[PDB]
């Protein structure tokens, strides 16, 4: 296969076998340690972080009886998320998003999940996610996660991811609010570049979230026999959530469009202003310079000596020329 992961910092393998009586915890790095839990009939959860270690992830993927196509989809990072259906297993890819201040661009990390028989696999490209709340919920016997099957864990991970999307949406909402307020107060270049990057980020967020609602609708309507019917409505709930998310993105995009177009078509008007500022001063002052070069003549004879009060005359001439040249304008708003 091929490797295209951006990060090579760290690798980690974690296992989680839950039951109505006891849960199993095991922190390690050896790939072999997870072989026995695969044979267990109880539902299991596997976490692998770090796509740089291609050998171990390939061995795991081909050890569970998964088609190479799913494996190369896992290795592939630059593609739109979309769910894969099969007669035995299902495979799902998502682009979990995170945002930060001091620099306005979306941060996408690919997260892959596989549900086969009674086993859930999940692969993260980079260290750092928001999948813990369900972890400490199941760890402390909270909720009813233990009683239900692996589909509960699958859509719990999905709903946690869309909750992270909710958080990122509220951060972006703050972004539009502050950008619009600053633009209304003072439209300047920096806010305009912020508008550019916000528009690009909104387009990317749209491109990532639009497939999500279709994916959730597919998992709702298709209902493959692998997933138990008892969890059928719950997925729909997540779908509803995604719908909300999709909606807000659209609105936000509309807003930034309104924050862009009015700034564009008026730029030519700006040029006119510059025109006028470069013209009137060139209209009034340039002849004066010429005048300053004439009555400051340096011939052998000075005709100005014959003239009486010559400088009051020349200063008055320059002043009245300036006045007539400045009242030549502004008659139809050049200032």
């Amino acid at each position, epitope marked *: 296969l091929v490797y295209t992961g951006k990060y090579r910092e760290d690798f980690e393998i974690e296992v989680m076998n839950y039951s109505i009586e006891e849960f199993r915890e095991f922190k390690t790095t050896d790939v072999e340690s997870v072989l026995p839990f695969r044979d267990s009939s109880t539902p299991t959860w596997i976490n692998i972080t770090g796509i740089h270690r291609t050998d171990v992830v390939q061995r795991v993927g081909e050890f569970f009886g998964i088609h190479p196509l799913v494996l190369e989809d896992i290795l592939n990072v630059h593609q739109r998320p979309k769910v894969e259906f099969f007669e035995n297993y299902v495979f799902i890819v998502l682009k979990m998003f995170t945002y930060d201040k001091n620099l306005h661009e979306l941060e996408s990390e690919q997260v892959s999940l596989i549900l086969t028989k009674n086993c859930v696999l999940m692969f993260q490209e980079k260290i750092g996610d928001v999948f813990d709340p369900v972890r400490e919920r199941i760890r402390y016997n909270r909720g009813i996660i233990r009683k239900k099957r692996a589909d509960y864990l699958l859509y719990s991970l999905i709903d946690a991811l869309v909750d992270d999307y909710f958080v990122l949406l*509220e951060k972006i*909402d*703050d972004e539009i609010d502050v950008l619009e307020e600053e633009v209304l107060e003072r439209p300047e270049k920096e806010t305009v570049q912020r508008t550019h990057q916000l528009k690009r980020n909104l387009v990317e967020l749209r491109k990532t979230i639009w497939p999500l609602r279709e994916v959730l609708s597919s998992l709702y309507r298709d209902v493959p026999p692998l997933i138990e019917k008892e969890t059928v409505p719950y997925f729909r709930d997540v779908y509803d959530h995604t719908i909300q998310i999709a*909606d807000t993105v659209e*609105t936000f995009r509309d807003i930034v469009s309104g924050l862009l177009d009015v700034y564009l078509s008026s730029v030519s008007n700006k040029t006119n202003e510059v025109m006028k500022v470069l013209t009137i001063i060139a209209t009034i002052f340039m002849p004066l310079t010429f005048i300053a070069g004439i009555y400051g003549m340096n011939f052998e004879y000075m005709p100005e000596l014959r003239w009486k009060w010559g400088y009051p005359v020349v200063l008055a001439v320059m002043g009245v020329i300036a006045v007539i040249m400045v009242v030549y304008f502004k008659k139809k708003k050049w200032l």
Partner: antibody
Amino acid sequence: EVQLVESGGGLVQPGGSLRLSCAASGFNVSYYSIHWVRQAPGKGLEWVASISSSSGSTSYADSVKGRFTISADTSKNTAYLQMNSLRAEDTAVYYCARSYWYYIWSYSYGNAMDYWGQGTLV
Amino acid sequence: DIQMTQSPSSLSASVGDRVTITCRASQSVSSAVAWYQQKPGKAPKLLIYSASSLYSGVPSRFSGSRSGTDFTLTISSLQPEDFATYYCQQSSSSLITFGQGTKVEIK
């Protein structure tokens, strides 16, 4: 016509348990949300409890989570708020509030408390 | 767990003056905040929810605004019945937290 009533207050001996009763008139408890908010004498207000009977979901304040139990029913248009493990810092005024949801964006929905009550000492 | 700070602790002004009370949010809250007044020995009164939408029946001279993550409750002109305590609340989630409470004082 619409107004909100409170009851169940009074002097409390430390270490005891007491139940506050919230009556309603002009409106029903089921349709809207009912909150309980505590204000210390001269200090800031604190939302202590929430209830929404129609949906059935119930949420409690973090600083009180586990101490109190809140519920309501439309049989008598009543809201019950039982409290145990009381202490002297709870010496404040407790208020009933009628709250309705409102829409700001398609993803996050706000909340507001329009009608309150005179409250009782706790 | 989102808290909500308010400034100043208290303010003093006379009738016919514009006063601004600011509300800072340590964590992000989308737009869900509310502004309340509390006359002594009286139930709190809702004034402005969503930081830009006014309740029905409140004086028209009231207003509010939202800048970035921060919030502002401003009054163009005080009233003799308006000197009171003001309160800032956020309702981003089911866990809702109030503000410190600013006291309006006469000069």
